[PDB]
Design a protein around this nucleic acid. Sequence first.
DNA 1: CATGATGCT
DNA 2: CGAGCATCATG
Length: 579
Amino acid sequence: KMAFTLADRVTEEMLADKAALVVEVVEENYHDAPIVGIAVVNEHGRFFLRPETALADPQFVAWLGDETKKKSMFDSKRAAVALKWKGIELCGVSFDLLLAAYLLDPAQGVDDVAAAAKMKQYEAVRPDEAVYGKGAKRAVPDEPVLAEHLVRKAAAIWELERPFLDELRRNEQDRLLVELEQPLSSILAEMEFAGVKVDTKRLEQMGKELAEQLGTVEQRIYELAGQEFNINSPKQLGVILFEKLQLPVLKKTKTGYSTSADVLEKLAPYHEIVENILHYRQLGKLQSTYIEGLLKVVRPATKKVHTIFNQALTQTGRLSSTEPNLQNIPIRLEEGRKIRQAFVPSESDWLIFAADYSQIELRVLAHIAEDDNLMEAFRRDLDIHTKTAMDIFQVSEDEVTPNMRRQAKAVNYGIVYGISDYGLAQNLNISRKEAAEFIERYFESFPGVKRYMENIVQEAKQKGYVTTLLHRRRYLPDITSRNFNVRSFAERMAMNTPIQGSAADIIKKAMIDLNARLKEERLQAHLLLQVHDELILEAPKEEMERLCRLVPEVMEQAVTLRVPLKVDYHYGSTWYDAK
DNA sequence: CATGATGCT
DNA sequence: CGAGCATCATG
Ligand SMILES: Cc1cn([C@H]2C[C@H](O)[C@@H](COP(=O)(O)OP(=O)(O)OP(=O)(O)O)O2)c(=O)[nH]c1=O
Ligand SMILES: OC[C@H]1O[C@@](CO)(O[C@H]2O[C@H](CO)[C@@H](O)[C@H](O)[C@H]2O)[C@@H](O)[C@@H]1O
């Protein structure tokens, strides 16, 4: 039983200076999506409004946009962006229950009010799936059922704010919410709604050229196999490789024969079909994901793509990007990297500006490990891969080969992920004995890294969780498991999550500090994309010289560690050219 | 919906 | 038997 007014006009008592507010968008992708209902709960009552009415009401719209009128919400960014598509500004969000729940425990996967409510045993609200249905059954119910659901969501947010802020304070996460995550949500909403302009003619032309070149490679594969088959089917490719061609079976997957990139590398000495298959797959990814996917989702009249940054998903505090994912555009191979030529500035006489932290996770490892050898390399800006090579191969600087540096780089990032000697041997295609020596030599060279790995596992066992620089937490109950595989994966999380997560906290703080400085100076430059350790902007060409100073300095100053942060930056006419 | 491939940080 | 992700075609 919950009393509410199904209102047919806006009243002053709905425009209080503290309220919980629901602006319901049912479509998972909320860009230009319908708003299906509005609810407001405040000290005066509980109200459902039809959006045709509220959003055409001058005083409701002014209330939405008034910073001083404070709103508690769940997934404020989804409402902010859906309102921006309706030309309505939402301001004054002072509590976001989605981000509060995420900070309390990202492993709960909270993605609706009822899941956040479960954290406090609050039962007076149903799950969105119970009301809307799943999958093909998804639908807005009849008004009275809809209005009840949205009012119970707003009433849950109203009641839950205090309990969640108190727990956040106990976990030292109250500033993490209010000074970091909530202001970042507003920034992301602006980046998503601005979108990134795409040169669809270039994409369509690359799609033409790739369709030709896939057909060439496909045919050569069939020639070498002496049979036509589905190169993307594991069953069919495994029959050709391992039964027709009689190659050795190096690894199995749960359902058959592995054809992983590392397996295929090991098979390449046996048959020329193996290099061709690796090539086809690379081309197939460019066509199926990047070319065909971007062209599907670009808005044709503006040529913009509008991704969604999920702020409340990863276990370490990173963002993720979806529909489309703009954080995995190709770079490594030149064929794919040219996709970046299609990412252009949204106005004439504008340029793309890309700035990236240089080796942030290795700098963070040096800070948190307090390892004297490591921190000195960064404090003196010495090439850390060369430094590691000189240690794992034991040679002077001049004796380090191109190949030695490659191996030492693999060791340096491997350590950050908890690599075993087995993994290092597979990655490098070298003797496991040798791999083990490399790791042993690393820990002898960087003994504070070894101490940190022992100490953080112990801390996880004693406290039940590990933390990052700005006090994000990840719980690791498997750290005590009797199963070797389960325990070992938890220990690698304990080692890695403070690294990866503290790097995520640093670039999020940079984004907030950068947006402040751009606004201070009244620059037209603004953020387009974040790619984990990089920020991509666009700006009038005339703003370039200012951004060359301002962007790296804000990024580098975002926090102060036991080593410097270092930012590299590039600009040009397309994202490809910003190298 | 699951699988195992690809892409990025 | 190296951390965190999204996407695709196929099963
Ligand atoms: C190899 C590797 C790179 N990266 C990321 C970090 C960098 O932002 C990005 C590009 O890596 P690189 O530029 O290849 O690495 P680096 O900056 O250490 O190398 P170099 O000294 O040779 O210039 O990829 C990972 O996150 N994990 C990895 O295992
Ligand atoms: O709105 C982003 C925000 O919503 C959640 C659900 O609370 O995720 C939904 O929307 C995403 C963006 O389209 C989808 O990818 C996802 O499938 C859907 O559940 C939160 O996870 C997210 O932070």
